[PDB]
């Protein structure tokens, strides 16, 4: 209610020039050359059609992409308010490219038959599948990667949710997709952080950002009736933080698949990191920290740049959420920017 | 709600409705009376059974692809190329139907 | 030599210097040689170790 | 958005004011953003260097060094383009016009030059005004990059010859890539600077790494680790191509600088950056052949 | 909206702004007698010495 | 709600921060018995005068 | 070494209901709960500081559901303290930072209990040894 | 989702009437909580409630500065167009 | 814009106060994304690695690692520079000073270089405050590649060390239009031409597969078109090992479907055709001019967008 | 078990007022709902 | 200054200011009471080249 130092909130408690513009410009006339010397349903109405008169009174950190898919896959409920999606393209390659790009002593039969052999586990009509949620990746790596039960509690998390079968299906075809030089990235690309799905039966459309922050989007306590908001990681498994030693910086994300071929058979690591690095210095800190070069091709890891944490503090570890009755370590990023960036990995 | 789409700008209006059945009993009850028209041609196509795969071959490969081009020859059905392991078995699409 | 009972605690100092005060004791002081503590009495004993 | 007013000439026929009609949607690549700009300074005839209409080679140099801009609104004596280097990242939804493969919902559509395709399909020829216009075409990086060095190995196969790269399965059919005829002969014809360019550029490269390494090593940590890694590789290489070849420190370094120029000349010219990204809503999220499909500025 | 709800909420982000600007105005006096000191003590020599 | 200082230097600006907790009432409950005698009933209830 | 045990803990919650420690004013911020021995030992010699033998302690604080609080513990089922004046401040907001509304009454009973207060440092303290007055023949441990 | 239960105050007060008679346990899936209390049963009668038994707040304490010991120290003048200033000279002749 | 700000430390010299008026425009690299940052942070004196200053290799791989940000504005007690690899996002273009004897065009991508030219005007000295500054070169992506391979190579060679005589060939010494370019010869450090050999190395092994050897048959070829075609003849530089590595399929053929020629380009596209980037800073700029000025002059102010 | 949440409504009439002011955040679990705010949050509202 | 944020809208308020001492010469002074703790360990370790 007022304060002593004015001049500091008239600013804060809430152009000219335009206006200028227009007085010049348009005011101007002629110009230029020149010559020589009903109480509530009618209230509901009325206030969406001013809606309209006011967002067509005027005219950018925020971007909305929106599909419509199976819960097959994915499945937006059992997910929350922050969390990453990542699409699949093209299912029509049931290792038909496996012809190619797949070097000799490869069955490259195996894609086929294990992708086919999921469909059967889980034809082409209203809907197709995209979508893949991060979630369902850290189960079916759970047992691969390097941390179980912490990894195992999110396996948990999707079965109780979202089938065994189809984390098992879908970790067949990850072996093999591993296996054959065609990887699980150039598939899965990042799709965006899941404002709102609105599924019907085995339907879903789902909202979710292309880019821009998170934390400004139907925000709320959470989006609609559920809990509040965050781009949890879901995993002390994931989140791998980096920066062991730091100096404030924006922090930054990227997403990793890691691989192993033959040191444990086909390997897929995926995590997300955590560090202010642009991405030109990640390869190398990629480099190093990684032993999971083996040859036993040279291509281990491939990453892309899902965004900015322009702050590097809201990083919390939390394995305190619940997906249904399972608990999952999660950990909480305070604030995010999506940048989607783009797959590098030559080597 | 607004956003722009290509060539333009959308607002697309929504509306939060529920609802509830009040009786404790049935209180709609519908009757079929009188049929339009069949929908479908009520005659003889048979299954094939050389659409899908569940089934493990001959195993003579001669005895089996004898067999199996013997069958699909004309099927009104029968699959149009060599199966592909995706996409789907393919019936083929006839030029009119009546 | 435990690691089941060590690595099983917190780490926050703010809450093992107020437990620290009312540790349940592994001993009893109702016995004649001191036993292990039965399964239905607590101390709430100090120690600090 | 920054609209640029491209500037139709003077009285077009009418059969040709139809054919800027359908040109809505198509990529420009218009030399500066200049508020104002002809129609000359946009059409093929602009694309001119050493006398000649360019090659594939020369297209591509051009499409990295001009701004493309898709038409938005044509308009008689008229042409408005949005530049699509311009504004921020994310925003400016402008519509495109999809040809060949799908556009699914993302995947940061490449414009590559026409005649990878069906070549002269797409010139669209003004008579009245005596002008052409080549759209290139509006491919995924993946795909666009598959593609333009998928016709690089047919070229080098053609140059000497004496498993088809053509079929490409793409999404639900098989794509295809020769259009036989003549086309490839044409198509080949305007590769053939490409293709050179890929040739010299390897076969320049591995005999100055297979000279430099023996001639290298022998003269550290340098020695061990490089022989480290490289074991069966670098030197198994090296053993059988100067068997099938011949062999400087001198002419070495001096050829290592030119070399590592052109190199990275064709680095940049290929990979084929991708313009934009496709982000929908409220839409098909498959923007099917000869459909607008919405398109923002940055990957 | 136009609910008695859209109003207590809006009440309620009044009353989080003029807290923080009420904080961060007490943060200039504070600041004040915070960089005081740091000037003193950077014009002040060890008494020992 | 906690106050803060305005630094000054290569020092990040800090903002307010705010702080919300909420404590469960612990419960108990305690005993006692008084328990009388049988003859005292037939006394004081008369029913044995 | 009594000052820091005096000074060591931090104050909370001003109570007003709870004019509890007095003595010709000059409230009590504190209690010793001691031995009867080490008391004893400490009040010969070392903090014999002694504004004591009397307290003005106040009397009982209440609770109850009235109005209000019924008919959403019955329907519903919660409840809220107070919900009078927290109902109506929130909803005096929707017509009409410096949140002080508080509660404030009562102003107590006080007696005079003989007492043992103690300055240690500023503050005044009482001392309490309490085997003799609860605990003696309770047959209960000393806590 | 697990019934919050029938909440048997406010069905004290009805908004409405059922205008038929049925044996509903027949009707028995058509709802998401159904009881059979054949006479009176226990729990007609159970009542529960939690509630919120305080809430304390905090008061932030601003300091001024000028009503402090180390103001003494200084001489504190307000000079608006010190942003706009380049250099503050003194001089001293002693 | 996500500006971060550079406070002045104290006061520098009516002089040196002078002197930083007229860096807007430049390029600083800061070694965080910061909203706080300290003066000294961004000066040569930070480029210091332990106890030595990095020579004109070394800076490249300090630049290399940190984040180039182009001053737009200078205040009194602040600097105000953008994080062009993060805070680019202006509907604009913000403005590039060209400092170069070069010129930059229109669409020409910039990527920057320390200063490397015989003739050299990038010292700052500000005696207040013991820092200097050292402002990088922008230059066209085509010159900056050129720049590098010249001291990568002169670094190199040196190290063989050439055995044959004491004259080498020039490799110190440009050309871009006219005007002769001649760069700074002057200190190659171990660690500097290590890593800068170590990736040139390492990369140009991981271009060559097994379908390359299909390509090396070409050679032969290759000299064919050499001497009957204008072109094909300019493409061959005179100074070519492959004209002097002329001076063969092998069978072996892993069961016939892999498509090796294709999978031979990708790969040595990926590592070798990506050189000029992983040996020095790629670009992030390229000129862009409203005005439809098509060039920049040296000195000038060049109005620059995104990444080519 | 996830346990309660704070109410905000409650709050805006405080029943007391806590006397010390100190960081809190350190005594982290002596509540079984903690949070952390900064400068605002969305959730709040 | 406003300028925007990540997930929010800052606003960061500042000050310029400035100082001098006007003591000809020799004004505050410092001394030290006492040792709060020794911060390092104080003992053993070598130094590796």
Redesign the interface.
């Known amino acids: 209610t007022k304060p002593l130092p004015t001049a500091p909130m008239a600013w804060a408690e809430s152009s000219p020039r335009e206006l200028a513009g227009h007085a010049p410009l348009r005011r101007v006339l002629r110009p230029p050359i020149a010559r020589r010397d009903t109480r509530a349903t009618r209230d509901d109405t009325e206030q969406?059609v001013d809606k309209?008169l006011r967002?067509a009174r005027r005219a950018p950190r925020y971007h909305?992409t929106r599909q419509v898919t199976l819960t097959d896959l994915c499945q937006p409920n059992a997910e929350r308010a922050g969390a990453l999606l990542l699409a699949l393209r093209h299912?029509?390659?049931?290792?038909?490219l496996a012809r190619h790009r797949a070097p000799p002593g490869r069955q490259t039969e195996r894609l086929?038959?294990a992708?086919?052999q999921l469909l059967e586990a889980s034809?082409?009509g209203c809907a197709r599948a995209g979508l893949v949620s991060f979630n369902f990746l850290v189960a079916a790596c759970t047992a691969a990667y390097d941390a179980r039960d912490a990894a195992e509690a999110v396996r948990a998390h999707i079965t109780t949710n979202y089938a065994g079968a189809r984390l098992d299906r879908f970790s067949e075809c990850l072996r093999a997709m591993v296996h054959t030089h065609v990887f699980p990235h150039e598939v899965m690309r990042f799709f965006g952080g899941l404002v709102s799905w609105v599924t019907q039966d085995e339907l879903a459309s789902v909202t979710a950002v292309c880019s821009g922050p998170q934390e400004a989007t139907h925000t709320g306590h959470p989006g609609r009736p559920c809990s509040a908001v965050t781009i949890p990681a879901c995993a002390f498994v994931d989140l791998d933080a980096e920066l062991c030693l730091g100096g404030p910086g924006a922090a930054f994300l990227y997403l990793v698949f890691t691989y192993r071929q033959c040191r444990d058979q086909e390997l897929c690591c995926v995590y997300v990191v955590k560090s202010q690095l642009p991405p030109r210095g990640l390869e190398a800190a990629l480099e190093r920290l990684f032993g999971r070069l083996r040859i036993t091709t040279c291509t281990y890891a491939a990453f892309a740049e899902l965004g900015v944490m322009p702050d590097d503090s809201p990083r919390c570890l939390h394995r305190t959420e619940r997906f249904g009755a399972v608990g999952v370590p999660v950990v909480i990023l305070e604030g995010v920017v999506w940048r989607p960036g783009g797959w590098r990995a030559c080597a | 709600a607004?956003?722009?789409?290509?060539?333009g700008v959308?607002?697309?209006?929504t509306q939060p409705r529920g609802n509830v059945?009040l009786?404790?009993?049935?209180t709609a009850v519908a009757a079929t009376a009188t049929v339009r028209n069949p929908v479908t041609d009520m005659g003889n196509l048979p299954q094939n059974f050389y659409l899908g795969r569940g089934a493990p071959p001959l195993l003579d490969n001669a005895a089996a692809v004898y067999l199996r081009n013997a069958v699909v020859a004309g099927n009104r059905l029968g699959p149009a190329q060599p199966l592909?392991?995706?996409?789907?078995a393919q019936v083929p699409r006839r030029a009119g139907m009546d | 030599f435990t690691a089941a009972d060590i690595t099983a605690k917190h780490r926050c100092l703010e809450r093992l210097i107020v437990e620290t005060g009312s540790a349940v004791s592994t001993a009893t002081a109702a016995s004649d040689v001191q036993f292990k503590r039965p399964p239905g009495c607590r101390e709430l004993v100090e120690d600090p170790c | 958005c920054f609209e640029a007013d491209i500037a139709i000439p003077s009285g077009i026929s009418r059969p040709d004011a139809a054919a800027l009609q359908r040109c809505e949607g198509r990529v420009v690549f218009l030399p500066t953003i200049r508020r104002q700009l002809a129609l000359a300074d946009v059409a093929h005839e602009s694309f001119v260097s050493g006398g000649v209409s360019p090659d594939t080679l020369g297209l591509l140099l051009a499409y990295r060094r001009r701004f493309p801009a898709v038409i938005?609104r044509v308009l008689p004596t008229r042409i408005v383009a949005c530049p699509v280097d311009l504004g921020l990242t994310h925003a400016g939804?402008?519509?495109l016009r999809n040809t060949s493969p799908v556009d699914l919902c993302n995947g940061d559509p490449v414009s590559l030059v026409p005649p990878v395709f069906e070549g002269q399909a797409t010139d669209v020829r003004l008579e009245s005004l005596d002008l052409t216009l080549r759209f290139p075409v509006p491919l995924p990086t993946p795909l666009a990059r598959e593609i333009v060095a998928r016709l690089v190995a047919r070229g080098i196969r053609d140059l000497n010859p004496d498993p088809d790269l053509n079929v490409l399965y793409y999404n639900?059919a098989r794509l295809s890539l020769v259009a036989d005829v003549q086309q490839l002969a044409s198509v080949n014809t305007e590769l053939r600077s490409l293709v050179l360019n890929m040739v010299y550029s390897i076969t320049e490269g591995t005999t100055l790494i297979l000279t430099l390494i023996p001639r290298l090593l022998a003269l550290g940590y340098v020695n061990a680790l490089l022989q480290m890694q490289s074991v069966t590789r670098e030197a198994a290489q090296l053993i059988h191509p100067e068997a099938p070849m011949l062999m400087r420190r001198l002419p070495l370094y001096e050829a290592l600088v030119a070399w590592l120029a052109h190199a990275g000349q064709l680095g940049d010219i290929l990979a084929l950056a991708p313009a934009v990204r496709v982000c929908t809503?409220?839409?098909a999220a498959v923007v099917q052949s000869g459909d607008?499909?919405?398109?923002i500025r940055y990957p | 909206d136009g609910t008695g709800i859209s109003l207590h909420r809006q009440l309620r982000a009044i009353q989080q702004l003029a807290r923080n600007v009420q904080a961060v105005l007490g943060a200039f006096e504070r600041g004040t007698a915070d960089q005081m000191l740091h000037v003193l003590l950077e014009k002040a020599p060890p008494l020992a010495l | 709600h906690q106050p803060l200082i305005a630094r000054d230097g290569p020092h990040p600006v800090e903002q307010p921060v705010h702080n919300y907790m909420t404590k469960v009432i612990d419960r108990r409950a305690l005993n006692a018995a008084f328990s009388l005698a049988t003859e005292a009933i037939a006394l004081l209830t008369g029913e044995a005068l | 070494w009594l000052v820091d045990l005096t000074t060591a803990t931090q104050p909370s919650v001003a109570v007003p209901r709870l004019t509890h420690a007095d003595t010709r004013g000059r409230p009590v911020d504190g209690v010793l709960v001691t031995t009867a021995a080490i008391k004893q030992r400490l009040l010969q010699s070392f903090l014999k500081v002694e504004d004591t033998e009397a307290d003005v302690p106040v009397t009982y604080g209440e609770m109850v559901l009235n109005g209000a609080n019924l008919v959403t513990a019955l329907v519903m089922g919660k409840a809220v303290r107070s919900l009078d004046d927290v109902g109506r401040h929130l909803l005096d907001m929707q017509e009409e930072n410096r949140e002080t509304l508080d509660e404030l009454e009562s102003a107590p009973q006080t007696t005079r209990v003989r007492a043992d207060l103690v300055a240690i440092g500023d503050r005044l303290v009482f001392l309490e040894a309490l085997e003799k007055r609860i605990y003696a023949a309770t047959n209960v441990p000393y806590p | 989702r697990d019934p919050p239960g029938y909440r048997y105050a406010a069905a004290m007060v009805p908004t409405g009437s059922?205008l038929?008679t049925?044996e509903?346990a027949s009707?028995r899936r058509?709802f998401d909580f159904f009881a059979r209390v054949r006479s009176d049963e226990n729990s007609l009668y159970d009542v529960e409630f939690d509630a919120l038994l305080g809430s304390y707040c905090n008061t932030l304490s601003l300091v001024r500065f000028l009503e402090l010991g180390l103001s003494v120290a200084c001489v504190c003048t307000k000079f608006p167009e010190l942003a706009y200033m380049n250099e503050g000279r003194v001089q001293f002749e002693v």
Not at chain 1, 91 to 96: F, I, N, S, V
Not at chain 4, 292 to 295: H, I, K, L, S
């Open positions: 969406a309209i967002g909305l299912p029509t390659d049931l290792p038909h086929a038959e992708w086919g034809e082409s | 607004r956003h722009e789409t290509g060539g959308n607002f697309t209006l059945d009786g404790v009993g049935y592909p392991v995706f996409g789907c | 938005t939804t402008v519509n639900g809503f409220d839409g607008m499909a919405p398109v | 059922i038929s049925i509903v009707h058509l």
